[PDB]
Design a protein around this ligand. Structure first.
Ligand SMILES: [Mg+2]
Ligand SMILES: [Mg+2]
Ligand SMILES: [Mg+2]
Ligand SMILES: [Mg+2]
Ligand SMILES: [Mg+2]
Ligand SMILES: [Mg+2]
Ligand SMILES: [Mg+2]
Ligand SMILES: [Mg+2]
Ligand SMILES: [Mg+2]
Ligand SMILES: [Mg+2]
Ligand SMILES: [Mg+2]
Ligand SMILES: [Mg+2]
Ligand SMILES: [Mg+2]
Ligand SMILES: [Mg+2]
Ligand SMILES: [Mg+2]
Ligand SMILES: [Mg+2]
Ligand SMILES: [Mg+2]
Ligand SMILES: [Mg+2]
Ligand SMILES: [Mg+2]
Ligand SMILES: [Mg+2]
Length: 70
RNA sequence: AGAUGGUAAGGGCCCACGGUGGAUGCCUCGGCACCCGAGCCGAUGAAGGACGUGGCUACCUGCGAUAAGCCAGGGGG
């Protein structure tokens, strides 16, 4: 997404505990599956949202992997 | 009576223009040689692979369910 929103996403993710982080990823993964459904019926005009959520999930798992590895 | 020509189904030689074919010249993202530099990787799972991976994705490249990418530092504008 926008570069400032990535930065804010990383500040907030880093204030989350591993349990919060897992629960967020589980939520964003659900929304990603919702995006794939929508895109498969031709309903996702804004297809950039699929990639954005995928990288979001990557950042969150990266920070989750950070917090179990200081 | 005598004699000499017009005939071209087709063919031959030459001239013109085309078709085919891809020589020659020019060209080079490639290659060759020499020199110099530099020289190990791997159970912390190598080399090399299979299968995946993009909103649309046959192949190649990249990457690995965090999947043409994730975090940070440096360069750059
Ligand atoms: Mg998906
Ligand atoms: Mg598909
Ligand atoms: Mg993802
Ligand atoms: Mg005659
Ligand atoms: Mg004739
Ligand atoms: Mg004739
Ligand atoms: Mg003849
Ligand atoms: Mg030709
Ligand atoms: Mg050369
Ligand atoms: Mg070597
Ligand atoms: Mg390998
Ligand atoms: Mg591939
Ligand atoms: Mg696809
Ligand atoms: Mg290749
Ligand atoms: Mg799996
Ligand atoms: Mg996937
Ligand atoms: Mg990014
Ligand atoms: Mg970066
Ligand atoms: Mg930096
Ligand atoms: Mg930078």
């Amino acid at each position: 997404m926008k570069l400032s929103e990535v930065r804010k996403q990383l500040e907030e993710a880093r204030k989350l505990s591993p349990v919060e982080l897992e629960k967020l990823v589980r939520e964003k993964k659900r929304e990603l599956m919702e995006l794939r459904f929508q895109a498969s019926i031709g309903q996702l005009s804004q297809n950039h949202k699929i990639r954005d959520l995928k990288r979001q999930i990557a950042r969150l798992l990266t920070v989750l992997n950070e917090k179990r590895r200081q």
